[PDB]
């Protein structure tokens, strides 16, 4: 992992919520780069998201 820079429509919106709700944040990027879906894991009875 390497540090980068983030800005846009969803970045300045988190700052407004952080000032109104008075909390601290630490933004990072998703590893695999997907949104999320439920699949099957190693053909088992259980299912998980990604």
């Amino acid at each position: 992992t390497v540090p980068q820079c983030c800005y846009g429509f969803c970045i300045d919106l988190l700052i407004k919520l952080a000032r109104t709700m008075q909390f601290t944040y630490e933004v990072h990027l998703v590893a695999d780069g997907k949104f999320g879906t439920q699949e099957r894991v190693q053909n088992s009875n259980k299912k998980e998201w990604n």
Binding site: F23, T24, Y25, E26, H28
Partner: protein
């Protein structure tokens, strides 16, 4: 008619007590008694059980725990040798959850509840102390998985998921990397489920990470209190103890009272055939035993010397009594009694870890998100 009932114990005094109990039950049909000691191995036990079954041709077998502390591998051969002919066997002082499966153990019932059933007391304590954030810590065994599944079902009954469940393999001597993860969470209530020999390593590691001071609440079971765990145990640990389970004799008297009520209803049916005395001769399945154990588990007993005797559809006990203990100044004191379905504390005062006297909230809200 005459029908004898057999059992297997390892004590001369227990044999005399069983003889006195069957003689007293004779005054309540004709029945006899049959007992045999324990062998230092398994195949000897199996051959002795077969020989005693051939010599007496009993219709029911009772078995308790040996003087061994584990009491797990001992009742294993008797179960197979008996259930080969599908005859009911009642357990007296067994606590493992392996005999709770109807597949591997078909004909087996319990008089005391197993270790996997001390999860409703914790649920009632959480409901009465409004605790909603807990940290489960079980071991990588069958008992741990059974208790974890029971607690997860009890929690999901109200649609409330646990925060995080952590596991550790048995025989571990360094769980520092595991406890370092449970300290970065929101909850402050730690539920532990391990063995007396393994719990001593968790207590010795928690005392180094300052996880046993104020604001923390420790909830454990019965096996985590006794043994060598009291040597390394911080104050405020709320343990559990069974009412009369530890003593053998109270049950033997109560066991012969409920099984005899089924024999009166056993001989009152048609197509009745006594089990064969051919432990060596036959290999067939006796017609009795599927209908015998059907009404045996449903035999509602009125009242005995150790409380009411009931049975669920799993071959286990029901409506047990637990004493909510508490450790203060290296001395356990009784604080409450679990009345089967509710918790009622007495006038004694409760002490919490750290030294303060106040019910912790068991939650520490953080102001840093990801």
């Amino acid at each position: 008619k005459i029908v004898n009932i057999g059992a297997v114990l390892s004590t001369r005094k227990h044999e005399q007590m069983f003889r006195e109990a069957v003689n007293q039950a004779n005054k309540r049909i004709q029945l006899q008694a049959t007992s045999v000691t324990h062998k230092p191995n398994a195949i000897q036990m199996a051959l002795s059980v077969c020989e005693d079954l051939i010599s007496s041709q009993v219709y029911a077998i009772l078995v308790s725990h040996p003087p061994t502390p584990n009491d797990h591998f001992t009742p294993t051969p008797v179960s197979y040798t008996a259930g080969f002919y599908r005859i009911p066997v009642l357990g007296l002082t067994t606590r493992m959850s392996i005999y709770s499966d109807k597949s591997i153990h078909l004909s087996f019932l319990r008089t005391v509840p197993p270790y996997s059933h001390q999860s409703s007391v914790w649920f009632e304590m959480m409901r009465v102390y409004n605790w909603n954030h807990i940290i489960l810590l079980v071991s990588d065994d069958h008992e741990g998985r059974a208790a974890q599944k029971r607690l997860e079902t009890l929690l999901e009954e109200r649609e409330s998921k646990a925060e995080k469940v952590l596991q550790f393999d048995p025989g571990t001597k360094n769980v520092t990397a595991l406890l370092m993860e449970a300290r970065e969470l929101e909850a402050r209530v730690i539920i532990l489920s391990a063995s007396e020999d393994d719990a001593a390593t968790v207590y010795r590691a928690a005392a180094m990470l300052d996880m046993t001071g104020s604001g923390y609440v420790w909830l454990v079971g019965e096996r985590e209190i006794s043994g060598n765990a009291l040597r390394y145990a911080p104050d405020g640990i709320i343990g559990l103890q069974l009412i009369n389970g530890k003593n053998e004799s109270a049950h033997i008297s109560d066991a012969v009272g409920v099984v005899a009520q089924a024999v009166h209803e056993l001989l009152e049916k048609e197509n009745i055939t006594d089990p064969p005395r051919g432990c060596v001769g036959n290999t067939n399945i006796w017609k009795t035993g599927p209908l015998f154990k059907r009404v045996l588990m449903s035999s509602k007993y009125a009242d005995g010397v150790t409380g009411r005797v009931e049975f669920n559809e799993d071959g286990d006990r029901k409506f047990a009594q637990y004493s909510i203990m508490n450790l203060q100044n290296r001395k356990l004191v009784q604080v409450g009694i679990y009345n089967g379905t509710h918790v009622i504390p007495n006038d004694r005062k409760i002490i919490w870890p750290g030294g303060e006297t106040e019910k912790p909230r068991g939650y520490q809200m953080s102001t840093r998100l990801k």
